[PDB]
Design a protein around this ligand. Structure first.
Ligand SMILES: Nc1ncnc2c1ncn2[C@@H]1O[C@H](COP(=O)(O)OP(=O)(O)CP(=O)(O)O)[C@@H](O)[C@H]1O
Ligand SMILES: [Mg+2]
Ligand SMILES: [Mg+2]
Ligand SMILES: [Mg+2]
Ligand SMILES: [Mg+2]
Ligand SMILES: [Mg+2]
Ligand SMILES: [Mg+2]
Lengths: 337, 331, 328, 331, 328, 337
């Protein structure tokens, strides 16, 4: 039972993550929960070998001298994984997080026309948000696949590391892995503006300069897709402005008001009778809402979403009233009722 | 079929852009849509060679060590291209953006005397703005051509890369390509002050230091031309100030109030044709800027017709739906 | 009578601390009081040897060149100790603070459902606070044990040194000893985000960077547990913001308003706790910088299980008043 | 006549200080006045040798490379001295300041129960203040002796240099000489938090970092003792806050409001005898500190007699002219 | 036709500037207008040689590696030039700006007693300001000549490069060329305080440090003359403060309030001047940060010889209005 | 006519400064005015030799590589000078500023009992102020001489470079030259507090840390003497507070209110019928004035000086009404009348 077999098994079980940890049997995360594989405990020596054998010399050196490190690893014909290796009280440990391989279509995900409308906009900013493991990336991949299926455009991506690999259908697709194909988000973004892109994917909007450049890229007239870890349209908007220092808030607020096209905040819910399903809050950037943003009256937006049904807007709670246990629903509702 | 041939072909097809991307055949953008040329897929090795061949040694080094780079490239008798080279999951790639060569005249563009009046000012700051493809450089080129036709002055430009190439008529024209003729906007702007210029073009008022130097250059007594991607005179004025940290905002606001002469915010519309919002820097407006009451400026434009001011929406009242797509106030 | 024997003795006597100090016999702290063990005085040479013998070569070098140092030390089968070694007028000295090994359960500590509710939250920041000794680590250990007993999650900890050692029950538990299993809090925290953790214990809100990363980790969706030495929910909240320079305060304030789930400030014996729970109103208080009002907001939050330190104290009267915000 | 002999002689003469200065004979300060000992002038070479002989190699290096240094020195059976060595126009010089050895008791100093109550607090910050020669260390020594006599606690001190040497009675006493037993106040204070102390002495709340750490140490739950040269409870409280830059003032103010237990500001008067202003940290006063209304505190002291508070002027009402020389309000 | 001949010709034509630009014949600026000399176009190779030949090896290196550079150049018996060398689309280029050599007197410039009164002050700061070209150096040179004619003082100057060369009449005059006679403004200014100067010309208020030292020099008791490119007394005062970071603004404001004696803002031909004189009221305006009021304070300061730019302009009407603060 | 002769001549003429400057004859400053000595012009080569010959190798190197430098130079039996050497358009130049040798007594300077009273105070801060060349230092030297004549105290000085050299009479006098006997003002001041000093001279109060330490030294209970370039008691006080950043102003203001004993602001005036005489504004630190300082109402102080005659206070203008031409007087009066 080598690491290849273990990973293959994890994939067979539909696991998102495989954990090694000295003094424990291998464990896998499935639908959120980490559980032990029915195998013997792995002692430090074994865990250490399993890791050290895969590593290359640099990785070994990084790991050995810094005590921890990150890298990507591939099991030909099975999947790619992002690997983190580290030390803990019992010894070595690692986490192999599976990189999703096949891209799932909007139909496969049960995503309706509203997502297409949101994808279709000719320019601006679209944000897909939610905490870790909420599926944001998969939703994005579907939106990009849809565009790849329908427009003769250029999709350029900046990813750290690249997750989904798309194949060029109608769109030219160029994916750029940070640290390997480019030196950083900033460099790639400053380049993006010179790479004739209709559509630009920016993996995550935390470090300010990325955000500035992302906004510039949207204002300048591209279609920009970014992400955050926020749980509602409002919090998303607060988050984007709040992070900047006072002197810089007004322009960010204005840029955002002009460029923001939609916000999709998302969570996964244990599906009644097994598996999980996504629930989405959806906001669409209409003049009134743009004023709410521009005037700093976002507090009102939640109801504006409530009344935006005709465009396909919906609050998280609304969506939850449409598969899931009422209690599960209430666990995640803004207003438990 | 070398890169020269490919670009020639692209031009023959009226393409705006040529794309190379490892693992694909060459592709071209025509009337918006990217398409494949009927040729075999190009693999990394081939794309890489094609790019390597055009590059000079510095460009190769930049590209090789930084993993991406930008430069201008010329195909004698055909066109000049804005080039970016980069790497991606399948390997190497590059984008060739054609650069329009000839400078079109105010008349050819149907630009009236107001633009001449704006060009004519003896010193200060003039900003031409709008999204990409709004036609900012085009408007600027015409303004500079007009000056070239009429004044015995020195026009200095700093561009990344050089877009329109002017020929010295009455003006001495010196155009400086960033990364090739100079190390950066800042360096060229610091030198500008000692290069006896009357008129300076700065391609895009993006970096704080470029803006500081641009404002210095205008305050010091030259006529400075810059650009932004903003969509109205007000937003332009906010933005120039907004970008600076708190400690520095007041002086930028004051400098700007003193030096700003005009703002021309622009967009292209089908019939394409340009529409312009035009603001002219009168004492009242300068106070609006100085006192931080730019919110009032939009109406001040509305009432400045005598000087040739006009809001974007006003100009749009000279397809109705196309118009409304771009109007501040759809009506 | 070597240092191993001394420490064993200290444990046998239920001492929290063993002191060595040139010119004195060994001394131990028991229920608060430091007292001499009935042994001869130890002279500089002897104390120095006792310390020097335990130290490893780096520790010896640190100690010799910096004149003082800290390290952890273990007596197999007895306990682990937080050791500090230093110099004083009569010569060398050292202080061994024993480490509580056994995890105690919420029930063993008489901690009620409110702690479970606080533990249960799916993400955000929870702060357990109080002066030295006050029992923060213990309260945390119980909270983590409860999670370990109930959820199939990943608990990652970062500690300087590791205090309590948990055994993986339903949770996978990874404990990381600073300086040994990782180079620092920052490194481990930056790594944490990519070690698929549900729950993260940050042993020390050591520096601004640790706090930043802790907040990032909470905001990103994990459940983070941290500590401060503050004595009340309000002071805790102030302190988290106060420590940052002006330019950075607003964002920390905002991040905190969004992510903070609870604050538990504590003192010891039996533990008394102030408990605050992160409701919208309180989040506004934090966001708007009106935390001054929060103390009463705690007073009126009984339904959720909130309570002021003084309230809890109303469950010796004098001992109580020694530690009350409002002696009455 | 070596330096040992000289110091012995100084002690024999009841001198507080011995001065060496190249180009002069040794000199001693007695009852305030500096005088020459009946000996030949000492030239640079001689003074330098005399100093070199006492110094250890580090002290020599410090002195040689930094041109001046400080250290403690002991003459067995006579006294300990605070030493500073330095250079001046005529050459080398040094100052030997005698350090009083024995710790005097509260009773010997006529200090009443209030001082015990202040000493007794379980944690927080206590500040003893006044100009040089006011008797701050003396008061502190007595407070620590009292604790040494009564509690089974750990007293840790950090001193530059160690002034009074305590002997471990009920308390474990660890005294740390800066530059010799530790590298600095900050290092020793950072270690203190891990040296299981009940009570910590910090000789002079002068540097920001020392203050920050002192406040941390008090807030974290220890009883911290510090000193300043301020002359009243209010001024002391202002000063502790004043010294910090704006961004940091609020937290220092808050920390202090929570942790401050007492302030004892002191001066010596002929009859010498000590006079004390005494403040005790009650909720009302803590608010005064917290809200930044310390201006009111002086009267709050006036009305705090029941707890043993007293203004400097009040205490002075227990020569009338000598008294008035030192009164806040001469009357 | 070498560069010496070209420059000689430019001087013969009374040109302010000579331009070289690959692909063009030499061009000269005369009374504002740049025009071609009747000569063949100069190609890159030729322009490059012309420049390369004058340059020294460092200059060549600077130019070659940085792509552009600045230096001074002298044509014995003709003039000195401020040379800038650079690159452009057609190839090399360069700009030689002639240096006004001859000092002109206050009388020759029609400058009245007010300038003498301003020159005469025993210490403090005097600022002569205005856009490029406006005639600041000239106005200064006249002020210094007047002092040179009347006081037995020490005039020290620091310049990049030296423009006007004074001859020692009653004053000892020491002129220091930056990069050649001194390493920088800062160094020279720090030195100035110990070169026993009565009067100091700071050629460029180059950076914050220069300003600091200039202010120190004025405050310390010397008479300091400096320049800025601002267009009015108010803007000058604002600018001197604005340039500093927040923490430092107050002290600069205060120093300036105390030391500032006069501001002379100027434009060109004939010169027009705005003149402000440092009276207590104005000093308060500066100190209290109410400079906004100063413009009228100038209007009412005629008795001392103050005058707004617009006032002076009321001594072609259109030309006048081109440069008026208030066109009327 | 070598440099020694030149300097001797300058001293014979009572000059404060001798200037060399390529292309000019030697010039000397006497009573304020620089005038040419009746000698031939000195060309670059000669000036350069005159300077280079005196310099030591380090000084030559400093000078040669930094293009300018400073040092002290001594002409045995004549005087010491502070020398600055530099380059200018005509070539080399230098300034030899004579360091005053004999110390002048209060009587020799016509200073009355008020100065003694001010000197006599047991502790606190005394400031002697005035622009360059106003004689401040000489006044101080007289005050120190007086103390040296009368008290058995320790006078410690920190000077950059040491000007007047005092001889130990009743006081022990230790003078410390900055850069030579100590590394800096701060170091020496931190040492001073440990060197048993009754009286401490701090040469100049500009760089903040020196001021902080100076104030500490005064508050702690020594008698501190410092200087500034200000022209009146008020401006002196404003100057000391104004220089600090906002957060630090209050404590400086308070420290100063408690410690300040007197301020003596001074100027020299061309004496009618030849030479010059000093005029002084004198303020003495009484409780009322201390409140003015403490409460930040220094604006009132000028009149408080006017009414402080009994203690020997006087405004600059008052003193001017007591040797000098009325016009000369008005040149320097706060209120010309
Ligand atoms: N009371 C007085 N009457 C006449 N001349 C005096 C004088 N006091 C000083 N001088 C002369 O004035 C010159 C400067 O004196 P001093 O050096 O004491 O002033 P100062 O304290 O301003 C030095 P600095 O200019 O460096 O601040 C010297 O030539 C000195 O002899
Ligand atoms: Mg993802
Ligand atoms: Mg353009
Ligand atoms: Mg603990
Ligand atoms: Mg003491
Ligand atoms: Mg000039
Ligand atoms: Mg002096």
């Amino acid at each position: 039972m080598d690491i290849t077999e273990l990973l293959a098994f994890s994939a067979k079980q539909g696991a998102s993550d495989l954990h090694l940890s000295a003094g424990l049997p291998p464990m896998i995360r499935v639908d959120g929960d980490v559980r032990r594989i029915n195998l013997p405990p792995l002692e430090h020596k074994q865990v250490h070998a399993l890791i050290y054998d895969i590593m290359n010399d640099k990785q070994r050196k990084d790991f050995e001298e810094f005590l921890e490190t990150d890298f990507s690893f591939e099991v030909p014909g099975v999947a790619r994984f992002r690997v983190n290796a580290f030390n803990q009280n019992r010894g070595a440990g690692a986490v192999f997080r599976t990189i999703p391989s096949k891209v799932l279509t909007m139909e496969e995900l049960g995503m309706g026309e509203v997502f297409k409308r949101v994808s279709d906009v000719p320019r601006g900013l679209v944000l897909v948000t939610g905490p870790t493991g909420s599926g944001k990336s998969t939703t994005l991949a579907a939106m990009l696949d849809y565009l790849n299926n329908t427009k003769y455009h250029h999709i350029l991506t900046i990813e750290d590391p690249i997750e989904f690999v798309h194949e060029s259908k109608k769109c030219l697709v160029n994916q750029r892995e940070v640290h390997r194909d480019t030196l950083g988000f900033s460099e790639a973004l400053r380049s993006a503006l010179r790479e004739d892109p209709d559509i630009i994917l920016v993996g995550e909007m935390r470090d300010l300069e990325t955000i500035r450049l992302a906004l510039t890229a949207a204002e300048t007239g591209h279609l920009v897709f970014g992400t955050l870890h926020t749980t509602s349209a409002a919090k998303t908007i607060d988050r984007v402005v709040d992070v900047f220092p006072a002197e810089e808030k007004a322009m960010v607020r204005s840029m955002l008001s002009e460029s923001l096209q939609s916000v999709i905040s998302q969570t996964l819910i244990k599906k009644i009778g097994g598996g999980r399903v996504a629930a989405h809050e959806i906001m669409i950037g209409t003049p009134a809402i743009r004023n709410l943003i521009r005037e700093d009256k976002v507090a009102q937006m939640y109801s504006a979403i409530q009344t935006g049904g005709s465009l396909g807007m919906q609050t998280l709670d609304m969506c939850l009233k449409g598969l899931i246990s009422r209690e599960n629903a209430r666990e995640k509702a803004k207003i438990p009722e």
